[PDB]
């Protein structure tokens, strides 16, 4: 689902047409569309540096992850770890264009806590990684430079929720 499809799916379960008030709310989502595309474009256009700088900060904070015996030690494990950061940011970015977290829940987060528990991947350290990507992604999305000035506070709050949802899930 995207945010429009969610409203529809709730209405179909009640057997109802959408009210004018609900059509107004959908109109409003369209008015926020250019801002939302900027958000997706900005995060996506910086995805490599977002992942890499967050991972670097994580390993800097938690040197035991990369020390021999650590879960991110060896190049195969480090590569898995970088790919997880990329995958999570990738699904978060889908949630932002959708205005709905179902794609992130259904295709990424569902069962992931269990996955990590079974592999011995430290879910809590993943959460730290995701929160640093959150902070960088928002600072980038909400950069007042090189864009028409306006207020994106509602969106930045919404972006926040997806990253927090992921960090909670892991």
């Amino acid at each position: 689902l995207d945010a429009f499809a969610k409203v529809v799916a709730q209405a179909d379960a009640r057997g109802e047409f959408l009210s004018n008030t609900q059509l107004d709310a959908l109109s409003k989502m369209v008015s926020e569309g250019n801002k939302r595309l900027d958000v997706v474009n900005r995060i996506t256009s910086n995805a490599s540096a977002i992942v890499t700088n967050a991972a670097r900060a994580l390993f800097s904070e938690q040197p035991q992850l990369i020390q021999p015996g650590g879960n991110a030690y060896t190049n195969r494990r480090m590569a898995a770890c970088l790919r997880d950061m990329e995958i999570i940011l990738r699904y978060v970015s889908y949630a932002i264009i959708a205005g709905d977290s179902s794609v992130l829940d259904d295709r990424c987060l569902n069962g992931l806590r269990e996955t990590y528990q079974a592999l011995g991947v430290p879910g809590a350290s993943v959460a730290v990684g995701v929160e640093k990507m959150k902070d960088s992604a928002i600072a980038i999305a909400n950069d007042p430079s090189g864009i028409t000035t306006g207020d994106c506070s509602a969106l930045m709050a919404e972006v926040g929720t997806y990253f927090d949802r992921a960090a909670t899930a892991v």
């Binding site: 179909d12 959408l18 059509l23 109109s27 569309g33 595309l37 997706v40 996506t44 794609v103 295709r107």
Partner: protein, 159 residues
């Protein structure tokens, strides 16, 4: 299916981030929202008239549906109520499509399994085709809002 879910699906099927190729697709979805929402708002305000009007047009095009014995027919109060209910389902699905910029709601809620249902319950596709044609002929929309409404109506007719 909406232009947004399709954009995501296209990116995800290749394991990649959204590119401009998909962002431009979503831009198109926003650009056509004015027309789609004009149609959705009008069809919705006029729902009662269009539904009951279409049901009556179907019985007049196919008078046997008012008289032939059998549960598949509008030859009982129950039958008539089913028929008006059904046409209301089609009109509601058209509005949902308009609202999301795509066929998804009709596809999922109505078209999947349609052939099997009509066959099983001995409902004739032609009855619903006439209802759909009545809606098209009677919504009173113009400009690109009519284009939008008619695209989805015609989508159902094709189904």
């Amino acid at each position: 299916k909406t232009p947004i879910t399709e954009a995501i699906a296209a990116a995800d099927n290749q394991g990649r981030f959204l590119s401009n190729t998909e962002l431009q697709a979503v831009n198109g979805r926003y650009q056509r929202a004015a027309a789609s929402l004009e149609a959705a708002r009008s069809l919705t305000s006029n729902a009662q008239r269009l539904i009951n009007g279409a049901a009556q047009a179907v019985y007049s095009k196919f008078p046997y549906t008012s008289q032939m014995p059998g549960p598949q027919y509008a030859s009982s109060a129950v039958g008539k109520a089913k028929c008006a209910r059904d046409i209301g389902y089609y009109l509601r699905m058209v509005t949902y499509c308009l609202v999301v910029g795509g066929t998804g709601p009709m596809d999922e809620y109505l078209i999947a399994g349609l052939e099997e249902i009509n066959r099983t319950f001995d409902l004739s596709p032609s009855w619903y085709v006439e209802a759909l044609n009545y809606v098209k002929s009677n919504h009173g929309l113009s400009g690109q809002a009519a284009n939008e409404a008619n695209t989805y109506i015609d989508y159902a007719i094709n189904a």
